[PDB]
């Protein structure tokens, strides 16, 4: 009955659950707002999907994120991955596939790591 989408985000050892529901427009990380949770210089890494997609896409959703593990940098990268993948999955399920494809195209044109986490394996020059 309720519109709800749960999306994970991943870095070295920092993981993020983001549940996106129908709402008024808030984004909370660990119960505190997104403008509070980061080091003061990496908030520009957090605001990257919102500024790519515009605020009109985030006008309708409410995203709640939990993070665990990692350091400050790994947790910030996990939060921005959870934000981007979360709004793309909500627009996949509950509005049109053309809007899903437009959001995916804008995010992939900026940075692919907002959608697909690339782990660093060990394969040096063999």
């Amino acid at each position: 009955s309720v519109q709800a989408v749960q999306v994970f985000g991943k870095k070295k050892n920092a993981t993020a659950v983001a549940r996106c529901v129908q709402g008024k427009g808030l984004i909370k990380v660990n119960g505190k707002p997104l403008k509070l949770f980061a080091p003061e210089i990496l908030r520009a890494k957090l605001y990257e999907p919102i500024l790519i997609l515009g605020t009109d896409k985030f006008a309708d959703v409410d995203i709640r994120i939990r993070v665990a593990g990692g350091g400050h940098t790994s947790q910030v990268y996990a939060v921005r991955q959870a934000i981007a993948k979360s709004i793309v999955a909500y627009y996949a399920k509950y509005v049109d596939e053309h809007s899903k494809n437009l959001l995916k195209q804008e995010l992939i044109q900026f940075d692919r790591s907002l959608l697909v986490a690339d782990p660093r394996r060990c394969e040096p020059k063999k």
Binding site: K100, K104, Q105, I108, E123
Partner: protein, 839 residues
């Protein structure tokens, strides 16, 4: 380029279940291929396919004795008649029962048809081709008579020579004689006395003796002689004689009455032909291992045409010369892969039968069948040179054939035994990479050395698609570890850059200008990556665009069937602007690589005898025992070799048993043509060649208001401004007008026209003169055109080289035709004449 693809000829299969036919001239051979009818012109090597398509497989072909009208019957009796000179569909009409016999009258006014027990003689409809002031009627067929004086299947119908009587041969062991209208000294008599049912009843030339050939292998003569007690005569039997084919029953016989000879094809594949009225065995031989299904004879009488249904196996036999005219074989398994030749004249396909064969695009015949693989053949590939073909297969060997000598100069194996399922080859032709499902390493051999260079590794799963870059610097592998690899092999450092994806990689393809690559995953999405800076630049989510399904034995809705929602194979255009994508589904998608939209979607088959060709099956075919196309009906067969089920339980990939009732629709390989303007796709029905339609569609380039064909010919003939007339014709884009002005300007003003011609119309002009060299008999004129064009616009084409690559390729193969066809003969003639003149 213009993505306006109609359906050109089917190819890759030469015969399927159905009747064979000759033209009344004797040259064209009409053969049914699934639900279409190919015409093989045999006097000049050509072939085409009629534009219709039946919903089920062809049951019957008939042809009006004038030659013009063809009438094709599907299963369940849906008939399409069409005009063979102007290849257009004329009438659709449904006989409500499955047609099991059909014969047109030699006068041309009637045709008789046997629906299982019934015998209906119909009128032949009046057509717009034959009347001056006439049109399509609504219901054109007028029934003349119906006869149900019969007890079982009508297996044959044969008219007289004066077209007043006909004979119906049966399955209730009795041939009958019928009339068209009520004659004076006639009763519709029966001809009883057989043992296993008549195959065919035939008249003689002077219609006194009529012959009956039955299924057990016995042919009887029938004459109108008096009863042995002597107005009082009876159609009785004068002599009987038997084909002594030992352990077989004859499946189809024919009888040429003008020359008096009878041919019979038997269940063990050995046919025999006999000069009938004294029954001297002319000869006999074994054309097929399986059986012979349908025999027809030439109108002249000098050619025979046999068709076996279980394989492709169509062959025409010239009996007095004792030699084949053609002996052709389609694939009897799933066509696994295909590639065009880099010239573009011939394509080569590799199926799971174990054979690979090289079909010619014109004339539709296979020209060589390489048969050294002992298991199913997967991917085949060419080099840039086009003379060498490398084929991988499941018997563990990547073989390497040379097509100027037709022998595998190399065979490669892995030391531990693998079964290769995918392969790529460097465009230099010196390195072969191949990958399998058993080991996750990816093997590399050298062509000029023969031994194994390396086993590259770094994949956590079996490697599914390999592609060498067309410049020659980068191998790309794609594997079920959700990963792809940019292998750089040829540099001094051998490196591997991974591309992490979301699901298992199914296909990898390059752009021709090698900066881009498209990889198709198992989600159903295409991702366009860059190879220099390895970042995804584009993407299509294409599940809905290809999802067309619901096979029989499928308890999901066609929208919920996963497995037919991915792209198994993708190929760029030779332009590089449009992908073409095909999977295990009914639809072929044609995407744009820049604007990321689906330009055009195609449907491979209308054929309802295949399994997955409509996404909403109807509830009429669902009984209370499952669907109606699922009950095992082998037990209702007259022949033991048809009744025996030698099938293995749970064998998806081929078994020699191969029940194969209602096979699935899947596009296992697609390829664009290197000359442009065509692609083709290996379906299960055949090998469909789609091509652009430019002659049946008006499409100007950049037109003004005062530019008509009348104005173009006016500035040609009156004003004599040849460059203006030619630019106006290329601007109108009508091929007849372009040909008219092109032939009309003179060969001394060619140079002035080319010197002042525009560079926006240069590539269209190069393509046009390439087509005119390959088709028209004005060879020195077109070569002066090509010479003036390249001598004037030399540095522009060499500067571009990517925008004009297809135009240069088709010009190159046009001058390759003229270089190999006439000047070798001219040189050999002048050297032979010089020697014979020097004694």
């Amino acid at each position: 380029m213009k993505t306006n693809f109609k359906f050109s000829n089917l190819l890759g299969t030469v015969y399927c279940r159905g009747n064979l036919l000759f033209s009344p001239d004797g040259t064209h051979l009409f053969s049914p291929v699934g639900n279409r009818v190919t015409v093989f012109n045999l006097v000049e090597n050509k072939s085409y396919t009629f534009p219709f398509a039946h919903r089920k497989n062809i049951s019957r072909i008939g042809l009006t004795p004038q030659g013009n009208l063809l009438l094709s019957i599907d299963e369940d009796g849906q008939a399409i008649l069409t005009n063979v000179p102007r290849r257009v569909v004329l009438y659709h009409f449904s006989f409500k029962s499955p047609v099991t016999a059909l014969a047109f009258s030699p006068s041309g006014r009637h045709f008789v048809v046997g629906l299982k027990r019934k015998i209906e003689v119909w009128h032949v409809p009046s057509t717009p081709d034959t009347n001056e002031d006439g049109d399509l009627e609504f219901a054109p067929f007028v029934r003349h008579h119906t006869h149900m004086q019969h007890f079982d299947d009508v297996r044959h119908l044969e008219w007289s020579s004066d077209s007043r009587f006909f004979l119906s041969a049966s399955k209730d062991l009795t041939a009958r004689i019928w009339s068209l209208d009520t004659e004076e000294g006639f009763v519709p008599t029966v001809l009883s006395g057989h043992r296993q049912g008549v195959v065919g009843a035939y008249f003689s030339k002077d219609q006194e003796t009529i012959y009956t050939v039955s299924k057990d292998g016995a042919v009887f003569e029938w004459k109108y002689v008096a009863k042995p007690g002597h107005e009082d005569m009876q159609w009785r039997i004068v002599n009987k004689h038997f084909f002594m084919q030992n352990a077989a029953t004859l499946r189809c016989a024919a009888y040429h009455a003008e020359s008096n000879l009878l041919v019979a094809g038997f269940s063990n594949g050995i046919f025999g032909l006999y000069e009938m009225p004294d029954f001297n065995l002319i000869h006999t031989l074994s054309i097929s291992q399986n059986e012979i299904d349908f025999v027809t004879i030439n109108k002249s009488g000098e050619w025979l045409a046999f068709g076996a249904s279980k394989l492709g196996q169509l062959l025409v036999w010239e009996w007095q010369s004792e030699s084949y005219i053609l002996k052709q074989q389609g694939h009897f398994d799933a066509m696994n892969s295909l590639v065009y030749s880099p010239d573009g004249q011939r394509i080569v396909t590799a199926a799971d039968d174990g054979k690979i064969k090289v079909w010619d695009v014109e004339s539709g015949f296979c020209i060589v069948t390489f048969t050294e693989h002992t298991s199913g053949v997967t991917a085949c590939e060419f080099a840039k040179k086009g003379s060498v073909l490398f084929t991988a297969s499941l018997d563990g060997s990547v073989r390497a054939w040379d097509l100027i000598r037709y022998r595998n100069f190399r065979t490669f194996t892995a030391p531990e035994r693998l079964s290769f399922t995918c392969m790529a080859v460097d465009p230099s032709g010196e390195v072969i990479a191949a990958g399998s499902i058993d080991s996750f390493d990816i093997h590399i051999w050298s062509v000029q050395t023969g031994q194994l260079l390396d086993r590259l590794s770094g994949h956590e799963g079996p490697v599914s698609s390999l592609a060498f870059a067309p410049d020659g610097s980068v191998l790309v592998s794609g594997s079920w570890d959700r990963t792809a690899r940019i292998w750089s092999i040829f540099s001094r450092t051998q490196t591997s850059e991974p591309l992490q994806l979301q699901s298992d990689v199914l296909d990898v393809a390059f752009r021709p200008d090698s900066k881009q690559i498209a990889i198709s995953t198992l989600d159903g999405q295409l991702t366009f990556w860059s190879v220099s800076e390895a970042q995804q630049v584009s993407g299509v989510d294409g599940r809905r665009d290809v999802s067309g399904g619901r096979r029989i034995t499928d308890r999901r809705t066609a929208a919920n069937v996963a497995g037919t929602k991915n792209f198994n194979t993708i190929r760029y255009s030779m332009d590089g602007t449009c992908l073409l994508a095909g999977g295990n589904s009914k639809y072929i998608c044609l995407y744009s690589t820049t604007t990321m939209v689906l330009l055009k979607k195609f449907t491979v088959s209308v054929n309802l005898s295949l399994s997955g060709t409509q996404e909403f099956l109807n509830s009429k075919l669902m009984t209370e025992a499952g669907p109606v196309g699922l009950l095992d009906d082998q037990g209702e067969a007259s022949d033991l070799e048809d009744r025996i089920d030698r099938s293995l339980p749970g064998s998806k990939r081929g078994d020699p048993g191969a029940r194969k009732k209602f096979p699935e629709v899947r596009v296992s390989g697609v390829a664009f043509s290197p000359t442009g303007n065509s692609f083709c796709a290996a379906s299960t029905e055949g090998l469909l060649v789609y091509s652009l339609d430019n002659t049946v569609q008006f499409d100007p380039f950049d037109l003004n208001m005062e530019i008509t064909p009348a104005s173009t010919l006016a500035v040609l003939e009156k004003e004599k401004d040849y460059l203006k007339a030619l630019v106006m014709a290329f601007r109108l884009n009508e091929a007849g007008l372009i040909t008219r002005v092109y032939q009309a300007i003179p060969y001394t003003d060619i140079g002035l026209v080319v010197e002042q011609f525009p560079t926006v119309y240069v590539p269209r002009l190069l393509r046009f003169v390439a087509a005119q060299t390959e088709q028209s008999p004005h060879m020195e004129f077109c070569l002066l055109w090509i010479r003036a064009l390249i001598d004037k616009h030399g540095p522009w084409l060499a500067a571009n080289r990517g925008k004009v690559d297809v135009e240069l390729r088709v010009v190159a193969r046009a001058v390759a035709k003229m270089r190999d066809e006439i000047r070798r003969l001219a040189d050999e003639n002048v050297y032979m004449v010089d020697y014979l003149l020097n004694q």
